[PDB]
């Protein structure tokens, strides 16, 4: 029923990810596309990509439940042309990594304008997305909501809509909702009226079909804190009671839930168990 997993390490190879996912009790995952520390990234070898696909098949992982997260360096809103250009080129490479692996989705944070203006930053993001999308095929870019820190763009869903609606290939732009980033920004999923408002907002701005992933993160801080410090499920200010409200909506259950909570595979296995404990304890249908 539930589509759930975690951000998984790739350091031992992409092909380990399907088994590792099953081993933590998941049926979905997110991975980085590389471990580059600068502006160039290698492709997986032919052998590595084939082995990954083989393991995906062996473990029966639904390809609609497998996601890449773009690297930490890319910033399509940067007012520094160096950074903008290098970001565009690395994002193209990340799309090609996804395409080689068969991954259908590449999730990005829109960017930060570093205090040079939301409108101008949105236009730079759009320009960058057009350069990437118009020179690649297949892969859909997911825009993730973020916290309101520095010059970040995307702390309100309206900002994601402004970007998406300007991109040429808007069918290749969809949305990821991160519960911690959202909670930081005033999206109060701890009350049913807050979840209803969130869903109404998604439906109006994008259509619900565009919600492709939820990043399921508790928060170390209260509603509105703008801190971006994730917490283990049930251990933060969203809490067991808040997640029970969020989980109760069928619209939410339809979308994969990907943990980005503190820790590694073992903590994530515990968090998946906690999610099911919450569903059971609160009698969620
Ligand atoms: Mg070789
Ligand atoms: Mn996230
Ligand atoms: Mn975060
Ligand atoms: Zn993210």
UniProtKB/Swiss-Prot annotation:
| Residues binding Zn(2+) 3 | 181, 228, 230
List positions binding Zn(2+) 2.
Answer: 144, 178, 215, 260
Q: Which reaction does it catalyse?
A: Endonucleolytic cleavage to 5'-phosphooligonucleotide end-products
What does the record's cofactor remark say about binding?
Answer: Binds 3 Zn(2+) ions.
* Binding residues annotated for Zn(2+) 1, in chain numbering: 69, 109, 144
**Cofactor(s) essential for the protein:** Zn(2+)
Which GO molecular function terms does the record list? deoxyribonuclease IV (phage-T4-induced) activity; DNA binding; DNA-(apurinic or apyrimidinic site) endonuclease activity; phosphoric diester hydrolase activity; zinc ion binding
Top-rank lineage group of the source organism? Bacteria
The record's section on InterPro entries has: AP_endonuc_2, AP_endonuc_F2_Zn_BS, Xyl_isomerase-like_sf, Xyl_isomerase-like_TIM-brl
Q: What is its EC number?
A: 3.1.21.2
The record's PROSITE patterns line, in alphabetical order, gives: AP_NUCLEASE_F2_1, AP_NUCLEASE_F2_2, AP_NUCLEASE_F2_3, AP_NUCLEASE_F2_4
Keyword terms of this UniProt record: DNA damage, DNA repair, Endonuclease, Hydrolase, Metal-binding, Nuclease, Zinc
Record Pfam families: AP_endonuc_2
Q: Which NCBIfam families match?
A: nfo
Family as reported in the entry's similarity comment: Belongs to the AP endonuclease 2 family.
What's the protein called, per UniProt? Probable endonuclease 4
Source organism per UniProt: Thermotoga maritima (strain ATCC 43589 / DSM 3109 / JCM 10099 / NBRC 100826 / MSB8)
